Amino acid sequence: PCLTGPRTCKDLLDRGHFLSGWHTIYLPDCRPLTVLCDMDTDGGGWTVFQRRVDGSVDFYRDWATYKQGFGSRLGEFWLGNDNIHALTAQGTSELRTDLVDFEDNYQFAKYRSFKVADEAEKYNLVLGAFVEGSAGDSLTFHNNQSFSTKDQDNDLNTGNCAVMFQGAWWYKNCHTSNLNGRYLRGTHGSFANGINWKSGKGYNYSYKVSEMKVRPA
Amino acid sequence: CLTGPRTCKDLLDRGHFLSGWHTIYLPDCRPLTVLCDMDTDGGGWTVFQRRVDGSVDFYRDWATYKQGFGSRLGEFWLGNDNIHALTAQGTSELRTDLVDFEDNYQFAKYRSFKVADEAEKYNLVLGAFVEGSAGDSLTFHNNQSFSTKDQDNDLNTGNCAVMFQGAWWYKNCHTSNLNGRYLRGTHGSFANGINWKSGKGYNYSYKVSEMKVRPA
Amino acid sequence: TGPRTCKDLLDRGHFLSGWHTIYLPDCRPLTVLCDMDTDGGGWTVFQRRVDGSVDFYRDWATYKQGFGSRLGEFWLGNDNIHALTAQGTSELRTDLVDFEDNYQFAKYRSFKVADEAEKYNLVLGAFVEGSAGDSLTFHNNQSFSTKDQDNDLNTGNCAVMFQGAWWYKNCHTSNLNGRYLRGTHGSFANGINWKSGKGYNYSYKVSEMKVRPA
């Protein structure tokens, strides 16, 4: 009953589910997990692990919360670090980042591979090559970095990157990207604490939509 | 049934951490797709009422409140038969969540909450106010049949549901009216909005409202 | 056996609109959107525009298999729409909203689309009623045209001029798969347009196309 069923969003597309939405796939350890499949963007078949859309969900959360995931299938959410690792351990998944502004401009960025280690390794980020994408690289800077929340500081910054830029991320010292920052709605005066992608709209603009998704590379 | 999930609390305990529509099995093993709020106040809440944008007409008749109405994609009332079925084993709390148009949030938690069957006209059986920023505006409605425009069971020589375009355990008539008209903030009209008297009062209609239960 | 249509589901006490799985006459599952509210309820919805978030200017293979998101806009796909209609008599119905929240509709006694061999050909009954007027009878007995597949009768490219897919003739009175232009637009007839409704220069806020047994 675990071997009958699907294991990625790509499988489901291959089996003729053409509509984006929440489907259940089976983890490599046979745990069933209800994921969001984007069956439309760039060929379709993407499993979506992060999604901001309207600012309705608090993303300024603690380690246990980022661990297990939070939010709503009906809106915004983080799939959870255990799940993101589970999905990306064994094998090779490409990463697509899709973004939108409040002026309705669509941007993206695409990476060759994407993997996060387990909690023992603080969900460490293993990033392949920037392939292309009109949003430009603002993730490579964050390669080989542990992931930090406000209540657990694993960055290379003598202070707390998560309290400062008000998010949660593979911070370094601190970031060129902050997709789990505060939903600030466009141009903001405050520094780099919005849904920010430095090479995109920069440190003072917070996107309307953001999605981070994976697909078997 | 029986092994599977009985409540939204079960589903959380079993590792569904994301809010959303899941199917649970009632005290009678009838399968029921409900909305689980896996986030608020510990999570594990089954949500039976939701206003969010004003897209759904709530000024409806008895048969409609009976069976429920609305959309999983937005606003809805789970239906009185279902709400009764859900709280029959009268040991589950009520939380009322409310958001204004400046994103200021408020709430009100009650220690038990139960509605009788249609025979007893979905009478409201409410426990104690425990805590909450909304102030308490539900108690006043304890031990009262539920009325809709076409089924007048209030203590008011007229038709309360008509006079406040809603449906409720109306007395004479109300201090709370969460099924009233989606009036969008301050309104001139009297007490016919999504109103909670002790909250923002008789002339302010909230942006969001949710009524949810969980086993104590 | 189980759920053949959204009407079945309503008859079984699913009163809330939303995505349910039903069983096509071949017995293939399909998760469809049920509108359990409008005009008695029990409608299976095969098209929906709501906010302009999804690109509808797509190619034949894409309209074939469907595209979009259960969370928003989408086209159920022509194979599914054919599967969905052909076997029985389903009764089309269109719901249009303009930006001043004015509501209009049209209803048709029957609605069917042929298979891909016949170019998903539109086979349409008579106008029952509709305050939107009738901007679709005009399109009866016409193959589907995508920007990349031209089967229209303007030897120019209808789909390209107006950017959308439809059973185009020479060219259109309705264009519900056109560009989400947000109300009044200067460009000609390339929005979400229904000619007898708010005409060739207004693009609705919402549009839905849904079917139900007669």
Ligand SMILES: *[C@@H]1O[C@H](CO)[C@@H](O[C@@H]2O[C@H](CO)[C@@H](O[C@@H]3O[C@H](CO)[C@@H](O)[C@H](O)[C@@H]3O)[C@H](O)[C@H]2NC(C)=O)[C@H](O)[C@H]1NC(C)=O
């Ligand atoms: C991820 O970051 C870690 C730090 O947490 C990086 O580890 C460091 O890697 C350098 C070389 O890249 C190591 O230097 C080597 O070791 C000896 C010193 O004992 C030196 O003499 C050798 O010549 C060699 O340079 C360094 O020791 C090491 N630091 C730590 C803290 O272990 C690691 O390289 C990063 N991983 C990737 C794939 O980038």
Ligand SMILES: CC(=O)OCC[N+](C)(C)C
């Ligand atoms: C930080 C965060 O995730 O919010 C919850 C705080 N808690 C669990 C201590 C009440």
Ligand SMILES: CC(=O)OCC[N+](C)(C)C
């Ligand atoms: C008021 C309301 O809930 O609508 C139902 C009335 N009827 C009979 C037209 C369906």
Ligand SMILES: CC(=O)OCC[N+](C)(C)C
């Ligand atoms: C709109 C709705 O579902 O209730 C009225 C019933 N109708 C329209 C079939 C008479």
Ligand SMILES: [Ca+2]
């Ligand atoms: Ca530090």
Ligand SMILES: [Ca+2]
């Ligand atoms: Ca009375």
Ligand SMILES: [Ca+2]
């Ligand atoms: Ca031509």
